[PDB]
Amino acid sequence: QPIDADVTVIGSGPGGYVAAIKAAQLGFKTVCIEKNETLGGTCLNVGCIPSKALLNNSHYYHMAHGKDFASRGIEMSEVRLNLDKMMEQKSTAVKALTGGIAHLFKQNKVVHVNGYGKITGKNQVTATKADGGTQVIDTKNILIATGSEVTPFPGITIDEDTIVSSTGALSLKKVPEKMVVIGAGVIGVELGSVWQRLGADVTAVEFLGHVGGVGIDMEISKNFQRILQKQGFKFKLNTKVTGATKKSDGKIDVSIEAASGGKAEVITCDVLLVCIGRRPFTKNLGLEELGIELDPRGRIPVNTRFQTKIPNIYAIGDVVAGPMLAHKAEDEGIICVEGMAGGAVHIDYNCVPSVIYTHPEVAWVGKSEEQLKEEGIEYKVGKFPFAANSRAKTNADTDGMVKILGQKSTDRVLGAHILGPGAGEMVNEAALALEYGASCEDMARVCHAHPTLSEAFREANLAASFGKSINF
Amino acid sequence: VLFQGPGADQPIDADVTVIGSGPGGYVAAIKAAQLGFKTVCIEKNETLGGTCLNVGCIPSKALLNNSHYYHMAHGKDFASRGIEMSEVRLNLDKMMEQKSTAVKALTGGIAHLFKQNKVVHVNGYGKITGKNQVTATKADGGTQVIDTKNILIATGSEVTPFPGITIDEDTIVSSTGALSLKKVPEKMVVIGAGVIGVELGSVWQRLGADVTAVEFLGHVGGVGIDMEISKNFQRILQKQGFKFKLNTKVTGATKKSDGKIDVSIEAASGGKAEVITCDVLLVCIGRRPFTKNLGLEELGIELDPRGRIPVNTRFQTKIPNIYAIGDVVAGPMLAHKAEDEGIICVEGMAGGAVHIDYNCVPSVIYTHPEVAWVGKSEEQLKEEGIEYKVGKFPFAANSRAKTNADTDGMVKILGQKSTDRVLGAHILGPGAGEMVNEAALALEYGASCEDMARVCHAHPTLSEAFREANLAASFGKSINF
Ligand SMILES: Cc1cc2nc3c(=O)[nH]c(=O)nc-3n(C[C@H](O)[C@H](O)[C@H](O)COP(=O)(O)OP(=O)(O)OC[C@H]3O[C@@H](n4cnc5c(N)ncnc54)[C@H](O)[C@@H]3O)c2cc1C
Numbered sequence: 001q002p003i004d005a006d007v008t009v010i011g012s013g014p015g016g017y018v019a020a021i022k023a024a025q026l027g028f029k030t031v032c033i034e035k036n037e038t039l040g041g042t043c044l045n046v047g048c049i050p051s052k053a054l055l056n057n058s059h060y061y062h063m064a065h066g067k068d069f070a071s072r073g074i075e076m077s078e079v080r081l082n083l084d085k086m087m088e089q090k091s092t093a094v095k096a097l098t099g100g101i102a103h104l105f106k107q108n109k110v111v112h113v114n115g116y117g118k119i120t121g122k123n124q125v126t127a128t129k130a131d132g133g134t135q136v137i138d139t140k141n142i143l144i145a146t147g148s149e150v151t152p153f154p155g156i157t158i159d160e161d162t163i164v165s166s167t168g169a170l171s172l173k174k175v176p177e178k179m180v181v182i183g184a185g186v187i188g189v190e191l192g193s194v195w196q197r198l199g200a201d202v203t204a205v206e207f208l209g210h211v212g213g214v215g216i217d218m219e220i221s222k223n224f225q226r227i228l229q230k231q232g233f234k235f236k237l238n239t240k241v242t243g244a245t246k247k248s249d250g251k252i253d254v255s256i257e258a259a260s261g262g263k264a265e266v267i268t269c270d271v272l273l274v275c276i277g278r279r280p281f282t283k284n285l286g287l288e289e290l291g292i293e294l295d296p297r298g299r300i301p302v303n304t305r306f307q308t309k310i311p312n313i314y315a316i317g318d319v320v321a322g323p324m325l326a327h328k329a330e331d332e333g334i335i336c337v338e339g340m341a342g343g344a345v346h347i348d349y350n351c352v353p354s355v356i357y358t359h360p361e362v363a364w365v366g367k368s369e370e371q372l373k374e375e376g377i378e379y380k381v382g383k384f385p386f387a388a389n390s391r392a393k394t395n396a397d398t399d400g401m402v403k404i405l406g407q408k409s410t411d412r413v414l415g416a417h418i419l420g421p422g423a424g425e426m427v428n429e430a431a432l433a434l435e436y437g438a439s440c441e442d443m444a445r446v447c448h449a450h451p452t453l454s455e456a457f458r459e460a461n462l463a464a465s466f467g468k469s470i471n472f
Numbered sequence: 473v474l475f476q477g478p479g480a481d482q483p484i485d486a487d488v489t490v491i492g493s494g495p496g497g498y499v500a501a502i503k504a505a506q507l508g509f510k511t512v513c514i515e516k517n518e519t520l521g522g523t524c525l526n527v528g529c530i531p532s533k534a535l536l537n538n539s540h541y542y543h544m545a546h547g548k549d550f551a552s553r554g555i556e557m558s559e560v561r562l563n564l565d566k567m568m569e570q571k572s573t574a575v576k577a578l579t580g581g582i583a584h585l586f587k588q589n590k591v592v593h594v595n596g597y598g599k600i601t602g603k604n605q606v607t608a609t610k611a612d613g614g615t616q617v618i619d620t621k622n623i624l625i626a627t628g629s630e631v632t633p634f635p636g637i638t639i640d641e642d643t644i645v646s647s648t649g650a651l652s653l654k655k656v657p658e659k660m661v662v663i664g665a666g667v668i669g670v671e672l673g674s675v676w677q678r679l680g681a682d683v684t685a686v687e688f689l690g691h692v693g694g695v696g697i698d699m700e701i702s703k704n705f706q707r708i709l710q711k712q713g714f715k716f717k718l719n720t721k722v723t724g725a726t727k728k729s730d731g732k733i734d735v736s737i738e739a740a741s742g743g744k745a746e747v748i749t750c751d752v753l754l755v756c757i758g759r760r761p762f763t764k765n766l767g768l769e770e771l772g773i774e775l776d777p778r779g780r781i782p783v784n785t786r787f788q789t790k791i792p793n794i795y796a797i798g799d800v801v802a803g804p805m806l807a808h809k810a811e812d813e814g815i816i817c818v819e820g821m822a823g824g825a826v827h828i829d830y831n832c833v834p835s836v837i838y839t840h841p842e843v844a845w846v847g848k849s850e851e852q853l854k855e856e857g858i859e860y861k862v863g864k865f866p867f868a869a870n871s872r873a874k875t876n877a878d879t880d881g882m883v884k885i886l887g888q889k890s891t892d893r894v895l896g897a898h899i900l901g902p903g904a905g906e907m908v909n910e911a912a913l914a915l916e917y918g919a920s921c922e923d924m925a926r927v928c929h930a931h932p933t934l935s936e937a938f939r940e941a942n943l944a945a946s947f948g949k950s951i952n953f
């Protein structure tokens with residue numbers, strides 16, 4: 001009745017499902033346990049995929065409904081939103097990708113066990129299904145990939161009705177007349193922008209003094225915010241939320257104050273989106289009984305092979321320290337499993353990119369100016385505006401800039417920060433450059449195709465390296 | 473002073489005199505000035521920027537971008553996303569205006585860059601009248617002598633004529649006329665299925681034209697394109713409605729009294745005579761180097777059989793202080809290629825080493841899907857006897873492509889069997905043009921397929937398809953396919 005396995009992965013998100021595939025490809029007999037109805041975890045089901053789908057669709061809606069298409073000779077009498085249809089495009093993509101993971105498991109001989117996994121022994125996982133049935137896996141190694149959940153706001157109860165997390169905000173049935181977003185991080189700006197574009201009056205309230213979350217370069221963040229404000233996305237920074245009240249008529253009263261000061265106000269909305277953060281998920285996993293203690297933020301401590309204190313039990317992804325990003329989880333899962341097979345285990349978190357899929361996009365990798373200043377690293381700056389880039393001007397899509405940070409003496413690239421068109425794709429060239437220890441001069445001399453947005457990356461490096469660009 | 477137009481005819485002394493202001497010449501001139509050379513740039517046309525800016529890359533990319541969006545709104549795409557529109561109509565004058573606005577801004581940008589960098593702009597027709605002298609003839613008949621230590625020939629290219637077919641930029645157009653058509657032609661025939669022909673054909677096909685391309689060779693996309701990529705690309709374009717008659721030669725064309733054009737064709741090798749009728753005939757069978765009335769013969773600079781100026785690895789002609797770069801010399805006729813040759817040539821004038829690796833120069837086709845490649849094709853690797861392995865990954869399995877419902881094509885990686893070195897990267901699909909620069913960076917370092925597979929590519933991005941194709945080439949199988 002029990003299944004014997006070499007590697008049992010708990011969770012099927014970007015970290016878990018890729019680790020399970022990789023382990024099977026390496027020859028391990030591999031089981032993946034998932035408690036939800038579909039595979040793919042947060043990113044695929046309530047995360048990256050549905051959010052990017054709505055960002056794409058609402059951007060195009062804005063281009064048709066506003067001024068952009070008219071300026072290009074694409075004239076349309078009546079542009080109307082069919083939100084049910086826009087949601088159906090999103091759901092169709094989620095369904096196709098979740099089914100794809102199921103096929104990949106079959107193709108690579110990963111055993112998929114449906115149930116709530118609990119570690120019941122150093123070499124045993126028990127999966128409990130919805131009806132209480134059980135499936136025991138006796139296993140050599142256990143890989144915890146149980147991911148994350150929304151961080152609640154104390155005193156405000158999310159009900160996914162009028163007070164939503166990102167999950168509810170991704171599936172609203174109608175465009176809310178007025179929406180408030182608690183938290184101007186990546187998720188908050190992305191989801192706020194979606195609904196702003198579709199007609200909602202949107203205000204984001206943020207305790208800190210900048211948008212875009214931790215580690216974003218402050219110059220980029222200010223310029224990004226200014227652009228979003230011109231689009232109609234309103235911001236109350238340096239503002240704390242003291243509470244929210246569900247009212248009888250179905251509306252929500254949000255009480256706010258100056259983070260430091262006393263500008264007490266109340267603003268009323270139809271939908272309140274709570275996205276102040278996400279946190280590691282380890283509930284009812286059996287960790288306490290094993291003696292695996294969590295760090296103060298709820299993460300599982302691991303060593304450089306991603307082993308917990310019990311060496312055949314591992315953890316990767318959103319359940320451990322580091323950036324809570326899908327590509328970070330994926331790489332940790334891969335190298336963890338490579339290490340199980342005896343190989344080297346390497347990830348450089350300074351080469352892990354971050355992206356914001358608004359329009360304009362924002363993307364960066366390496367160090368910000370503030371981080372370099374903190375660390376005492378002397379650096380030089382190169383900037384190149386997309387207004388001077390040939391492809392950006394050709395497309396009449398010219399917001400923003402590339403900023404390169406180079407070490408003063410050695411000319412090594414330390415950081416790349418992109419605000420504008422194509423930032424999300426472009427940052428991967430920058431990640432390669434950082435991984436290789438490239439110099440700013442190296443990047444200035446690579447033959448970039450003309451006309452491309454990437455030429456701005458070339459010119460920004462030239463400005464950092466030689467002092468001057470060619471086209472600005 | 474910094475502009476020497478009609479009426480400005482005093483002798484000029486220069487360190488470096490650049491003839492032509494296209495991508496090669498105008499960048500060479502800026503860089504030369506930045507290096508400390510007293511720099512003169514001679515241009516005969518009313519605006520700077522050469523073929524690429526005025527009748528080339530820029531106007532073509534503008535219409536490709538705009539016509540793609542027209543297709544998205546007018547066809548099925550926007551409806552499938554919940555964007556409902558009663559009547560989508562084309563305003564061609566307005567679309568052409570967007571194109572012209574971009575060209576004008578960028579041409580003015582070069583002029584500002586010249587002034588900002590103290591490049592002397594001489595407006596006139598340059599002719600080399602001595603080993604250290606160029607004479608510029610201006611519109612008003614004036615002449616101006618520049619005595620100069622070095623001369624940089626960057627005189628670019630022109631459309632290659634088709635014997636027996638007269639281009640009048642009316643109904644028989646070159647790329648220049650095709651970029652400014654006054655109405656969408658009911659039926660268009662394109663002679664030449666190279667990059668320029670496929671781009672311009674696709675533009676007008678999207679805007680409503682019935683488009684057929686006729687090509688003497690047996691593949692689409694021009695020289696050096698990977699054959700698998702080219703075949704799959706052609707198949708995709710045919711499904712869009714773009715028709716091709718490959719392995720076909722054109723025997724003539726006749727403008728008729730009713731304004732239409734009769735194009736006579738036959739099997740390139742054989743005789744399957746047919747006639748196809750169009751309203752507009754686009755002639756783009758090639759481009760060729762431009763050196764007319766430059767003084768080369770009197771200097772004794774003989775041209776190669778295709779009209780290019782021979783140069784050595786420092787881009788010196790036979791006369792050692794006279795150099796040439798860009799579309800007027802051998803190699804791929806591309807803007808970024810001209811620019812890089814100009815930069816290193818001028819750096820060489822200042823004493824530095826001069827080396828460019830043409831195996832790291834990418835090619836891009838800005839259709840939708842795009843096509844882009846750098847390094848070696850499979851055919852080249854086999855010709856050269858190089859043992860290689862193949863990794864492929866389809867955009868249908870890429871998360872960003874699927875989410876955006878934009879899934880044509882694939883990335884194909886070619887890696888060296890022994891060392892895993894990336895030898896070639898070939899991208900057919902969304903975002904190919906930007907993505908190929910990641911491969912160009914890799915080739916400059918001699919990076920491995922494993923190197924690429926282990927870079928943490930952001931999720932979800934199109935670039936992950938590049939990661940996965942490298943993983944397949946390096947380790948035999950990808951993760952998500
Ligand atoms: C709205 C939103 C947008 C985002 N957009 C992006 C983006 O664009 N790019 C990006 O890189 N990241 C993005 N993220 C973050 C990304 O989703 C996470 O970094 C990533 O999903 C973490 O992967 P993971 O495998 O560690 O965990 P998860 O994706 O959270 O997967 C964990 C899985 O384990 C399962 N599980 C947990 N406990 C058990 C148990 N005991 N038994 C069985 N199964 C269990 C869960 O059901 C879940 O399926 C976004 C997140 C959100 C909320």
Ligand SMILES: Cc1cc2nc3c(=O)[nH]c(=O)nc-3n(C[C@H](O)[C@H](O)[C@H](O)COP(=O)(O)OP(=O)(O)OC[C@H]3O[C@@H](n4cnc5c(N)ncnc54)[C@H](O)[C@@H]3O)c2cc1C
Binds near residue numbers: 629
């Ligand atoms: C429709 C089209 C689309 C294209 N798209 C792309 C693309 O997407 N990407 C790409 O990389 N390439 C593209 N190209 C090719 C690209 O434009 C050329 O490779 C590039 O312009 C060559 O640059 P160059 O500086 O060598 O010459 P040119 O750009 O041809 O510039 C030569 C200049 O010299 C001037 N001149 C010539 N003789 C004299 C003289 N005696 N005195 C004074 N001035 C003189 C000419 O007036 C001209 O301004 C395209 C070409 C066309 C036709």
